[PDB]
Coordinates of C-alpha atoms (C1' of nucleotides) in Angstrom, one line a residue:
Chain A
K27 CA 16.5 98.8 -56.0
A28 CA 14.3 95.9 -54.6
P29 CA 15.5 93.9 -51.7
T30 CA 17.9 91.0 -52.4
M31 CA 18.1 92.1 -55.9
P32 CA 22.0 92.4 -56.1
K33 CA 22.2 89.3 -53.9
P34 CA 20.3 86.6 -55.8
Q35 CA 20.4 83.4 -53.7
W36 CA 21.8 80.8 -56.2
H37 CA 19.4 78.0 -55.4
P38 CA 18.7 75.2 -58.0
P39 CA 15.5 75.1 -60.1
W40 CA 12.6 72.8 -59.5
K41 CA 11.8 69.9 -61.8
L42 CA 8.6 68.0 -62.1
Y43 CA 9.4 64.2 -61.4
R44 CA 5.9 62.6 -61.7
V45 CA 2.2 62.9 -60.9
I46 CA 0.3 60.4 -58.9
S47 CA -3.3 60.9 -60.3
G48 CA -5.2 58.4 -58.1
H49 CA -7.5 60.9 -56.1
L50 CA -11.2 61.6 -57.1
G51 CA -11.8 65.3 -56.5
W52 CA -10.0 68.4 -55.4
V53 CA -7.2 67.3 -53.0
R54 CA -7.9 68.8 -49.5
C55 CA -4.9 68.1 -47.4
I56 CA -1.4 66.6 -48.4
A57 CA 1.3 65.7 -45.8
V58 CA 4.3 63.3 -45.8
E59 CA 4.5 60.9 -42.8
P60 CA 7.4 61.6 -40.3
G61 CA 9.2 58.3 -41.2
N62 CA 9.4 58.9 -44.8
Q63 CA 7.4 55.9 -45.6
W64 CA 3.8 57.3 -45.9
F65 CA 2.1 60.3 -47.8
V66 CA -1.3 61.2 -46.3
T67 CA -3.1 62.5 -49.4
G68 CA -6.7 63.6 -48.7
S69 CA -9.4 64.0 -51.3
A70 CA -13.0 65.3 -51.4
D71 CA -14.2 61.8 -52.3
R72 CA -14.6 60.9 -48.8
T73 CA -11.6 58.7 -48.8
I74 CA -8.2 59.7 -47.4
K75 CA -5.3 58.2 -49.6
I76 CA -2.2 57.5 -47.7
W77 CA 0.2 56.7 -50.4
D78 CA 4.0 56.3 -50.3
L79 CA 6.1 59.3 -49.4
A80 CA 8.9 59.0 -51.9
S81 CA 7.5 56.2 -54.0
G82 CA 4.0 57.6 -54.3
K83 CA 2.6 54.1 -54.8
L84 CA -1.0 53.2 -53.6
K85 CA -0.5 52.1 -50.0
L86 CA -3.9 52.1 -48.6
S87 CA -7.2 54.0 -48.4
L88 CA -9.1 55.3 -45.4
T89 CA -12.8 56.2 -45.3
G90 CA -15.0 57.4 -42.6
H91 CA -15.7 61.1 -43.5
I92 CA -19.1 61.7 -45.0
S93 CA -17.9 64.8 -47.0
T94 CA -14.6 66.2 -48.1
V95 CA -12.0 66.4 -45.3
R96 CA -10.2 69.6 -45.4
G97 CA -8.1 68.7 -42.4
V98 CA -5.4 65.9 -42.1
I99 CA -2.3 65.6 -40.0
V100 CA -0.1 63.0 -38.4
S101 CA 1.5 63.2 -34.9
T102 CA 5.0 62.3 -33.7
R103 CA 4.5 61.2 -30.1
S104 CA 0.8 59.8 -31.0
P105 CA 1.5 57.3 -33.9
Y106 CA -2.1 57.9 -35.4
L107 CA -3.6 60.0 -38.0
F108 CA -5.7 63.2 -37.2
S109 CA -8.5 64.0 -39.7
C110 CA -10.9 66.9 -39.4
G111 CA -13.7 68.3 -41.6
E112 CA -17.5 69.0 -42.1
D113 CA -18.0 65.4 -41.3
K114 CA -16.6 65.8 -37.7
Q115 CA -14.9 62.4 -37.9
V116 CA -11.3 62.3 -36.8
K117 CA -9.6 59.1 -38.3
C118 CA -7.2 57.8 -35.5
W119 CA -5.5 55.7 -38.3
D120 CA -2.4 54.2 -36.6
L121 CA 0.2 52.6 -38.9
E122 CA -0.6 49.2 -37.2
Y123 CA -4.2 49.7 -36.1
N124 CA -5.6 51.3 -39.4
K125 CA -8.9 52.4 -38.0
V126 CA -10.8 55.4 -36.8
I127 CA -11.0 55.9 -33.0
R128 CA -10.2 59.6 -32.4
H129 CA -13.8 60.7 -32.4
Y130 CA -13.3 64.5 -32.8
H131 CA -15.9 66.4 -30.9
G132 CA -16.4 69.9 -29.6
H133 CA -17.4 71.8 -32.8
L134 CA -21.1 72.3 -33.3
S135 CA -20.8 73.1 -36.9
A136 CA -18.5 72.2 -39.9
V137 CA -14.7 72.0 -39.9
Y138 CA -12.1 73.3 -42.4
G139 CA -9.0 72.2 -40.8
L140 CA -7.2 71.0 -37.7
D141 CA -3.7 70.9 -36.2
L142 CA -2.3 68.7 -33.5
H143 CA 0.6 70.0 -31.3
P144 CA 4.0 68.1 -31.6
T145 CA 5.1 68.4 -27.9
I146 CA 2.1 69.7 -25.9
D147 CA -0.9 67.4 -25.2
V148 CA -3.2 69.7 -27.2
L149 CA -4.6 70.3 -30.6
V150 CA -6.7 72.6 -32.5
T151 CA -9.7 72.3 -34.8
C152 CA -11.0 75.1 -37.0
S153 CA -14.7 74.9 -36.4
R154 CA -17.4 76.5 -38.6
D155 CA -19.8 78.7 -36.8
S156 CA -17.6 80.3 -34.0
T157 CA -15.7 77.5 -32.2
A158 CA -11.9 76.8 -31.9
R159 CA -11.9 73.4 -30.1
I160 CA -8.4 72.7 -28.5
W161 CA -8.9 68.8 -28.8
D162 CA -6.8 67.5 -26.0
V163 CA -5.0 64.3 -27.0
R164 CA -6.6 61.1 -25.6
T165 CA -9.6 63.4 -24.4
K166 CA -11.9 63.8 -27.5
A167 CA -12.9 67.3 -26.0
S168 CA -12.0 70.9 -26.0
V169 CA -11.6 71.5 -22.3
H170 CA -9.6 74.6 -22.9
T171 CA -10.6 75.9 -26.2
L172 CA -9.2 79.3 -27.2
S173 CA -12.4 80.5 -28.7
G174 CA -11.8 83.8 -30.5
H175 CA -13.3 83.3 -33.9
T176 CA -16.6 84.5 -35.1
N177 CA -16.7 82.6 -38.3
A178 CA -15.1 79.4 -39.9
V179 CA -11.5 79.5 -38.5
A180 CA -9.0 79.7 -41.3
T181 CA -6.2 77.7 -39.6
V182 CA -5.0 76.5 -36.3
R183 CA -1.7 75.7 -34.7
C184 CA 0.1 75.4 -31.3
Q185 CA 3.3 74.0 -29.9
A186 CA 5.8 74.3 -27.1
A187 CA 7.2 77.4 -28.8
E188 CA 6.4 80.9 -27.7
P189 CA 4.2 82.8 -30.2
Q190 CA 1.2 81.5 -28.0
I191 CA -1.4 81.6 -30.7
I192 CA -1.9 81.0 -34.5
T193 CA -5.6 81.2 -35.7
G194 CA -8.1 83.4 -37.5
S195 CA -11.9 83.6 -38.1
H196 CA -13.6 84.2 -41.5
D197 CA -15.5 87.3 -40.1
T198 CA -12.3 89.3 -40.2
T199 CA -11.3 88.6 -36.6
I200 CA -8.4 86.6 -35.0
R201 CA -7.4 85.6 -31.5
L202 CA -3.6 86.2 -31.0
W203 CA -3.9 85.5 -27.2
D204 CA -1.9 83.4 -24.8
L205 CA -2.7 79.8 -25.3
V206 CA -2.1 79.1 -21.6
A207 CA -4.5 81.9 -20.5
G208 CA -7.3 80.9 -22.8
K209 CA -8.9 84.3 -22.7
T210 CA -8.7 86.9 -25.7
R211 CA -5.7 88.7 -24.0
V212 CA -4.7 90.0 -27.5
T213 CA -7.3 90.2 -30.2
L214 CA -5.9 89.9 -33.6
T215 CA -8.5 92.0 -35.3
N216 CA -6.8 92.4 -38.4
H217 CA -6.1 90.4 -41.8
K218 CA -9.6 90.8 -43.1
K219 CA -8.6 89.0 -46.2
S220 CA -8.5 85.2 -46.6
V221 CA -5.3 84.7 -44.6
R222 CA -4.5 81.0 -45.2
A223 CA -0.7 80.8 -45.7
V224 CA 1.4 80.8 -42.4
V225 CA 4.3 78.6 -43.3
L226 CA 7.6 78.7 -40.9
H227 CA 10.4 80.4 -42.7
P228 CA 14.1 80.4 -41.7
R229 CA 14.7 80.8 -37.8
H230 CA 11.9 79.8 -35.4
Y231 CA 11.6 83.6 -34.5
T232 CA 11.6 86.5 -36.9
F233 CA 10.5 84.3 -39.7
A234 CA 8.5 84.8 -43.0
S235 CA 4.6 84.7 -43.4
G236 CA 2.1 85.4 -46.1
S237 CA -1.2 86.7 -47.2
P238 CA -3.6 86.5 -50.3
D239 CA -2.6 90.1 -51.3
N240 CA 0.9 91.6 -50.6
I241 CA 2.4 88.8 -48.6
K242 CA 5.2 89.8 -46.3
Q243 CA 7.1 88.4 -43.4
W244 CA 6.0 87.9 -39.7
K245 CA 7.4 87.3 -36.3
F246 CA 6.9 84.9 -33.7
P247 CA 7.6 87.3 -30.8
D248 CA 5.1 90.0 -31.2
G249 CA 5.0 89.9 -35.1
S250 CA 6.9 92.2 -37.6
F251 CA 6.8 92.6 -41.3
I252 CA 10.6 92.6 -41.7
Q253 CA 11.1 90.5 -45.0
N254 CA 9.0 92.9 -47.1
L255 CA 8.1 90.6 -50.0
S256 CA 6.5 91.6 -53.4
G257 CA 2.9 92.0 -54.3
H258 CA 1.7 88.5 -53.9
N259 CA -1.9 89.1 -55.2
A260 CA -2.3 85.4 -55.7
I261 CA -4.6 83.8 -53.0
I262 CA -2.0 81.7 -51.0
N263 CA -4.0 78.7 -49.9
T264 CA -1.2 77.3 -47.8
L265 CA 2.7 77.3 -47.4
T266 CA 5.2 74.8 -46.5
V267 CA 8.9 75.9 -46.1
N268 CA 11.7 73.7 -47.4
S269 CA 14.3 72.1 -45.2
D270 CA 17.1 74.7 -46.0
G271 CA 15.1 77.9 -45.0
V272 CA 13.5 78.2 -48.3
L273 CA 9.6 79.1 -48.7
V274 CA 7.0 78.1 -51.0
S275 CA 3.3 79.2 -50.9
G276 CA 0.7 77.3 -52.9
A277 CA -2.0 79.5 -54.6
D278 CA -5.7 78.9 -54.8
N279 CA -5.8 80.6 -58.2
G280 CA -3.1 78.4 -59.8
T281 CA -0.5 81.1 -59.9
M282 CA 1.8 79.9 -57.0
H283 CA 4.3 82.7 -56.6
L284 CA 7.5 81.0 -55.6
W285 CA 9.7 83.3 -53.4
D286 CA 13.0 82.8 -52.0
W287 CA 13.9 82.4 -48.4
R288 CA 14.9 85.8 -47.5
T289 CA 14.0 87.6 -50.9
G290 CA 10.3 87.5 -50.3
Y291 CA 9.4 88.5 -53.8
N292 CA 8.5 85.6 -56.3
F293 CA 11.8 84.2 -57.6
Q294 CA 10.3 81.5 -59.9
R295 CA 6.6 82.8 -60.3
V296 CA 5.5 79.3 -61.2
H297 CA 1.9 78.5 -61.9
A298 CA -0.4 75.4 -62.1
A299 CA -0.5 73.8 -65.5
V300 CA -3.8 72.8 -67.0
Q301 CA -4.3 68.9 -66.4
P302 CA -5.8 67.2 -69.2
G303 CA -9.2 66.6 -67.6
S304 CA -9.1 70.1 -65.8
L305 CA -10.6 73.0 -67.6
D306 CA -8.9 76.2 -68.9
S307 CA -9.3 78.3 -65.7
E308 CA -10.6 75.9 -62.9
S309 CA -7.5 74.7 -61.1
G310 CA -5.7 75.9 -58.0
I311 CA -2.7 74.8 -55.9
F312 CA -4.4 73.0 -52.9
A313 CA -1.2 71.9 -51.2
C314 CA 2.6 72.0 -51.5
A315 CA 5.0 70.4 -49.0
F316 CA 8.7 69.3 -49.2
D317 CA 9.5 65.6 -48.4
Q318 CA 11.1 64.5 -45.2
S319 CA 14.5 64.7 -47.0
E320 CA 13.6 67.9 -49.0
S321 CA 14.4 66.1 -52.2
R322 CA 11.0 66.4 -54.0
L323 CA 8.2 69.0 -53.4
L324 CA 4.8 67.3 -53.1
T325 CA 2.5 69.6 -54.9
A326 CA -1.2 68.6 -55.0
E327 CA -3.3 70.5 -57.6
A328 CA -7.0 70.4 -58.1
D329 CA -6.6 67.6 -60.9
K330 CA -6.8 64.8 -58.3
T331 CA -3.0 64.4 -58.4
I332 CA 0.3 65.1 -56.6
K333 CA 3.3 66.3 -58.4
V334 CA 6.9 65.6 -57.3
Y335 CA 8.8 68.9 -58.1
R336 CA 12.4 67.6 -57.8
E337 CA 15.5 69.9 -57.9
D338 CA 17.9 70.2 -60.9
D339 CA 21.6 70.9 -61.2
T340 CA 22.0 74.5 -62.4
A341 CA 23.7 77.6 -61.1
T342 CA 22.3 79.9 -63.9
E343 CA 19.7 81.6 -61.7
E344 CA 21.4 85.0 -61.2
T345 CA 18.9 87.9 -61.6
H346 CA 18.9 91.4 -60.2
Chain B
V9 CA -28.7 65.1 -45.6
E10 CA -28.1 66.7 -49.0
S11 CA -29.6 70.0 -47.8
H12 CA -26.5 70.4 -45.6
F13 CA -24.2 69.8 -48.4
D14 CA -26.2 72.5 -50.4
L15 CA -25.9 74.9 -47.7
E16 CA -22.1 74.3 -47.4
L17 CA -21.8 75.0 -51.1
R18 CA -23.7 78.4 -50.9
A19 CA -21.7 79.3 -47.9
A20 CA -18.5 78.5 -49.8
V21 CA -19.8 80.6 -52.8
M22 CA -20.4 83.3 -50.5
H23 CA -16.9 83.2 -49.0
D24 CA -15.5 83.0 -52.5
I25 CA -17.4 86.2 -53.4
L26 CA -16.2 87.7 -50.3
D27 CA -12.5 86.8 -50.7
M28 CA -11.9 85.2 -54.2
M29 CA -11.5 88.2 -56.3
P30 CA -14.1 90.4 -54.6
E31 CA -13.0 93.5 -56.8
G32 CA -12.4 95.6 -53.6
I33 CA -14.7 96.7 -51.1
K34 CA -16.6 99.2 -53.1
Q35 CA -20.3 98.3 -52.5
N36 CA -19.8 94.9 -54.1
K37 CA -22.6 92.8 -55.5
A38 CA -25.0 90.5 -53.9
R39 CA -26.5 86.9 -54.2
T40 CA -27.6 87.6 -57.9
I41 CA -24.3 86.1 -58.8
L42 CA -25.4 83.2 -56.7
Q43 CA -28.7 83.1 -58.8
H44 CA -26.6 83.2 -62.0
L45 CA -24.6 80.3 -60.7
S46 CA -27.6 78.3 -59.8
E47 CA -28.9 79.0 -63.4
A48 CA -25.7 77.9 -64.9
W49 CA -25.8 74.6 -63.0
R50 CA -29.4 74.0 -64.1
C51 CA -28.3 74.7 -67.6
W52 CA -25.5 72.2 -67.3
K53 CA -28.0 69.7 -65.9
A54 CA -29.6 69.7 -69.4
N55 CA -26.1 68.7 -70.7
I56 CA -26.0 71.9 -72.9
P57 CA -22.9 74.0 -73.5
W58 CA -24.5 76.9 -71.8
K59 CA -22.7 78.6 -68.9
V60 CA -22.7 81.6 -66.7
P61 CA -21.8 84.8 -68.7
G62 CA -21.9 88.1 -67.5
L63 CA -19.0 88.2 -64.9
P64 CA -15.2 88.3 -64.6
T65 CA -12.8 85.3 -65.0
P66 CA -12.3 84.2 -61.4
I67 CA -16.0 84.6 -60.6
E68 CA -16.7 82.3 -63.5
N69 CA -14.0 79.9 -62.3
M70 CA -15.3 79.8 -58.8
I71 CA -18.8 79.3 -60.1
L72 CA -17.7 76.4 -62.4
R73 CA -15.8 74.9 -59.4
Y74 CA -18.8 75.2 -57.1
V75 CA -21.0 73.6 -59.7
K76 CA -18.7 70.7 -60.2
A77 CA -18.8 70.2 -56.5
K78 CA -22.5 70.3 -56.2
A79 CA -22.7 67.9 -59.2
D80 CA -20.2 65.6 -57.5
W81 CA -22.3 65.5 -54.3
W82 CA -25.5 64.8 -56.4
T83 CA -23.8 61.9 -58.2
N84 CA -22.6 60.5 -55.0
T85 CA -26.1 60.8 -53.5
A86 CA -27.4 59.0 -56.7
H87 CA -24.8 56.2 -56.4
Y88 CA -25.8 55.8 -52.7
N89 CA -29.5 55.6 -53.7
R90 CA -28.7 53.2 -56.5
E91 CA -26.9 51.1 -54.1
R92 CA -29.9 50.8 -52.0
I93 CA -32.0 50.0 -55.0
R94 CA -31.8 46.3 -55.7
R95 CA -32.3 45.4 -52.1
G96 CA -33.7 48.8 -51.2
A97 CA -33.7 48.3 -47.3
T98 CA -37.5 49.3 -47.2
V99 CA -36.9 52.6 -48.9
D100 CA -39.5 55.6 -48.3
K101 CA -42.0 56.8 -50.8
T102 CA -40.3 60.2 -51.6
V103 CA -36.6 59.0 -51.9
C104 CA -37.6 56.6 -54.8
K105 CA -38.8 59.5 -57.1
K106 CA -35.7 61.5 -56.4
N107 CA -33.5 58.9 -57.1
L108 CA -35.3 57.8 -60.1
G109 CA -35.2 61.4 -61.5
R110 CA -31.5 61.6 -60.7
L111 CA -30.8 58.3 -62.5
Chain C
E9 CA 14.0 75.2 -24.8
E10 CA 13.5 75.1 -21.0
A11 CA 10.8 77.8 -21.2
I12 CA 9.0 75.4 -23.7
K13 CA 9.2 72.6 -21.0
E14 CA 7.8 75.0 -18.5
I15 CA 5.0 76.1 -20.7
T16 CA 4.2 72.5 -21.5
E17 CA 4.2 71.7 -17.7
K18 CA 1.8 74.6 -17.0
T19 CA -0.4 73.3 -19.9
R20 CA -0.4 69.8 -18.5
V21 CA -1.1 70.9 -14.9
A22 CA -4.0 73.1 -16.3
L23 CA -5.4 70.2 -18.2
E24 CA -5.2 67.9 -15.2
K25 CA -7.0 70.5 -13.1
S26 CA -9.8 71.0 -15.7
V27 CA -10.1 67.1 -15.9
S28 CA -10.4 66.9 -12.1
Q29 CA -13.0 69.8 -12.2
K30 CA -15.2 68.5 -14.9
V31 CA -14.5 64.7 -14.8
Chain D
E14 CA -48.6 54.7 -40.7
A15 CA -48.4 58.5 -41.0
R16 CA -52.2 58.6 -41.7
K17 CA -52.7 58.0 -37.9
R18 CA -50.7 61.1 -37.1
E19 CA -52.5 63.1 -39.5
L20 CA -55.8 61.9 -38.2
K21 CA -54.5 62.7 -34.6
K22 CA -53.5 66.1 -35.5
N23 CA -57.0 66.8 -37.2
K24 CA -58.7 65.5 -34.2
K25 CA -56.6 67.8 -31.9
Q26 CA -57.3 70.8 -34.0
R27 CA -61.0 70.0 -34.0
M28 CA -60.8 69.5 -30.2
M29 CA -59.2 72.9 -29.7
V30 CA -61.7 74.5 -32.0
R31 CA -64.6 72.8 -30.0
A32 CA -63.0 74.1 -26.8
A33 CA -62.7 77.5 -28.1
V34 CA -66.2 77.7 -29.2
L35 CA -67.5 76.3 -25.8
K36 CA -65.3 78.8 -24.0
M37 CA -65.9 81.8 -26.0
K38 CA -69.7 81.9 -25.4
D39 CA -69.3 79.9 -22.4
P40 CA -71.6 80.2 -19.3
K41 CA -68.8 82.1 -17.6
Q42 CA -68.2 84.4 -20.7
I43 CA -71.6 84.7 -22.7
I44 CA -74.2 83.7 -20.2
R45 CA -72.3 85.2 -17.3
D46 CA -72.2 88.6 -19.4
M47 CA -76.0 88.0 -20.2
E48 CA -76.7 89.2 -16.7
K49 CA -74.5 92.3 -16.9
Chain E
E11 CA -18.4 55.8 -62.7
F12 CA -21.2 56.5 -65.2
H13 CA -20.3 53.4 -67.3
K14 CA -20.4 50.8 -64.5
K15 CA -23.4 52.5 -63.0
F16 CA -25.5 52.5 -66.1
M17 CA -24.5 48.9 -66.9
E18 CA -25.4 47.5 -63.4
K19 CA -28.7 49.7 -63.0
Chain F
rU4 C1' 6.5 42.1 13.8
rU5 C1' 0.5 43.8 12.5
rU6 C1' -2.9 47.3 10.3
rC7 C1' -5.2 52.2 8.0
rU8 C1' -4.3 56.2 5.3
rC9 C1' -2.3 57.6 -1.4
rU10 C1' 0.0 60.9 -4.6
rU11 C1' 2.6 56.7 -7.7
rC12 C1' 4.3 52.3 -11.8
rA13 C1' 1.6 47.9 -13.7
rG14 C1' 1.2 44.3 -20.0
rA15 C1' 2.8 38.8 -14.6
rU16 C1' -3.4 33.7 -17.3
rC17 C1' -2.0 41.9 -13.3
rG18 C1' -7.9 38.0 -11.3
rC19 C1' -6.0 28.8 -12.8
rA20 C1' -12.9 33.1 -13.6
rU21 C1' -15.7 36.2 -16.0
rA22 C1' -19.8 41.3 -15.6
rA23 C1' -21.8 45.3 -18.3
rA24 C1' -21.9 49.4 -21.6
rU25 C1' -20.2 52.6 -26.0
rC26 C1' -18.4 52.6 -31.1
rU27 C1' -17.5 50.2 -35.9
rU28 C1' -18.8 45.7 -39.1
rU29 C1' -21.6 40.8 -40.2
rC30 C1' -26.6 37.5 -39.4
rG31 C1' -31.6 36.6 -37.4
rC32 C1' -35.6 39.5 -36.6
rC33 C1' -38.5 43.5 -37.7
rU34 C1' -44.8 47.4 -37.2
rU35 C1' -41.8 52.7 -34.8
rU36 C1' -38.4 52.8 -30.9
rU37 C1' -36.3 51.2 -26.4
rA38 C1' -35.6 46.4 -24.3
rC39 C1' -33.0 42.2 -28.5
rU40 C1' -30.2 37.4 -31.0
rA41 C1' -24.9 35.3 -32.0
rA42 C1' -19.7 36.3 -34.4
rA43 C1' -15.2 39.9 -35.0
rG44 C1' -12.2 44.5 -33.5
rA45 C1' -11.4 48.5 -30.3
rU46 C1' -12.3 52.3 -25.9
rU47 C1' -14.2 52.9 -21.2
rU48 C1' -17.0 51.5 -16.1
rC49 C1' -17.7 48.5 -12.0
rC50 C1' -16.0 43.7 -7.9
rG51 C1' -10.6 43.8 -7.6
rU52 C1' -5.3 42.8 -7.5
rG53 C1' 0.4 43.4 -7.7
rG54 C1' 5.2 46.7 -6.0
rA55 C1' 7.5 51.5 -4.1
rG56 C1' 7.9 56.8 -0.5
rA57 C1' 5.7 59.5 3.6
rG58 C1' 2.3 59.7 7.9
rG59 C1' -0.7 57.3 12.1
rA60 C1' -1.5 51.8 17.0
rA61 C1' 0.2 47.3 19.5
Chain G
rC4 C1' -37.8 17.3 -26.0
rU5 C1' -38.9 22.1 -21.5
rC6 C1' -36.2 29.2 -25.0
rC7 C1' -40.9 31.5 -20.5
rG8 C1' -40.8 38.8 -22.5
rA9 C1' -42.0 43.7 -21.3
rA10 C1' -43.2 49.4 -22.1
rC11 C1' -44.8 53.1 -26.0
rG12 C1' -47.5 53.5 -30.4
rG13 C1' -54.3 53.2 -25.7
rU14 C1' -57.8 54.9 -23.2
rA15 C1' -61.9 62.4 -26.8
rA16 C1' -61.8 67.2 -25.3
rG17 C1' -65.4 69.8 -22.1
rA18 C1' -68.0 74.5 -18.8
rG19 C1' -70.9 74.6 -12.8
rC20 C1' -70.0 72.6 -7.3
rC21 C1' -66.7 70.0 -3.8
rU22 C1' -63.1 67.6 -0.7
rA23 C1' -56.6 67.0 0.4
rG24 C1' -51.5 63.8 1.7
rC25 C1' -47.5 67.8 0.9
rA26 C1' -44.0 72.4 1.7
rU27 C1' -40.7 77.8 4.6
rG28 C1' -37.9 77.7 9.2
rU29 C1' -35.5 83.5 7.5
rA30 C1' -34.0 89.0 7.0
rG31 C1' -35.3 93.0 10.3
rA32 C1' -37.2 96.4 14.0

RNA sequence: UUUCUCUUCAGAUCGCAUAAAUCUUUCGCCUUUUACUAAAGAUUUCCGUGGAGAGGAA
RNA sequence: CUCCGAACGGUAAGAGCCUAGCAUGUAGA
């Protein structure tokens, strides 16, 4: 009856490997370095914890943000960190420099996240009041900022591909305009909910998407709800697809509905376990990302830790 | 200062009430839940087992999370004030009483 | 991804023009 | 140190009050109207 | 946190 | 053969010496600030300089 | 034993009378 019901993708099950409990507070951003040698693990204690990617050992700390930094990324062509938050301090932490020289500027209010382009010499920062600053690399200024948000921008993204926009304000108003034009050629006045899960699915185009209620698929060209997923009522706080087309969306309420690649509905329907220090109903999946080798999933819950959900050997996963 | 942190916490509480299980748009509640959360935080400041009853599960969870965030910010401000306590660095007159009360 | 390169070149030219105008 | 600023504010308020008192019943306001 | 703080203050 | 135009690449003590500013740390001060003192790191600005098209006088 | 510093934190506020170095270059009928 349901889509992909008589075609169960015989993928392996997840398996927790270890939890690196070294942060002090709810983890804000978690990302693995491109070289498979660093693991940028942010925390609300005003200290970016850049640990090891696969080992998870304490590599080094990095302060500079006065408050919780809800934005952290690492560039490819620009070997330097990229932080962003309410502190308005971008930690340009190079692997050899180990300092803060970015000096993110342009947002006249708080910041909830940012994203640097992989190829184009541009970026994006989710300002608080109404701004969407396209922080140009080696410019520290939003010369061409696609400002189409009336509240705190949920997320931001831009690259050499041609969806041309990824963003959305907190006042139920998004700007799916052309990044080259700058003007609001296409106002994405939809998704009034807290849309904070837009992970790349299979192909660059006609991929999957998410939402905090009834998550479904999307499309890079013009958008389309093709892969009709199940009723993902869980508030998907983020999503980082696997290396082999699979998709996983971390939930803000702890119930991370794990959907298959093309199935859409929750295949595992996993949840966030109650940590020993955490309360009964207080936790929530803040980040979830597969490693560079896609061997262990780095899932950072609200217990100030990062779990390594490795894969197990089993084909007994056939369900109608 | 800490006023900006308190304002950010209040805005986060409003955003959670709007998005974190708002019970659908059916003429929802108002800042009275914020008053309940503030009263619950004041009660916890007494180190008592009191809480914020009279609300659903995720509302209480978000209230506890925001209270923990505000308490962490307060403890951090207190640690920063105690750091500039031995030397002091010519502390003002009003900050001394606040740091003393926090400690 | 030739169109990607074209879009990137257009973005670079626009950024350079904006820098020359402001700076 | 702030007592100097407080005294300056008090003196400015008193000067404004005195100016208003001298101008309201001024020769151009009161005595000028006394002839009308 | 609280232990070292109350010990050195 | 000699010069002036200019988009362009510099890790050569780019300049057999030597200016400032901004930011982040550490001292001396400190009545508030701007002017400050003497050490480290980084980013820029100015006097400039090197090597390669095209276009203009003897 | 020759190394030498400057500004702000500064001059109460007031009603009657009086004097002046400066500035446009045009549209149009």
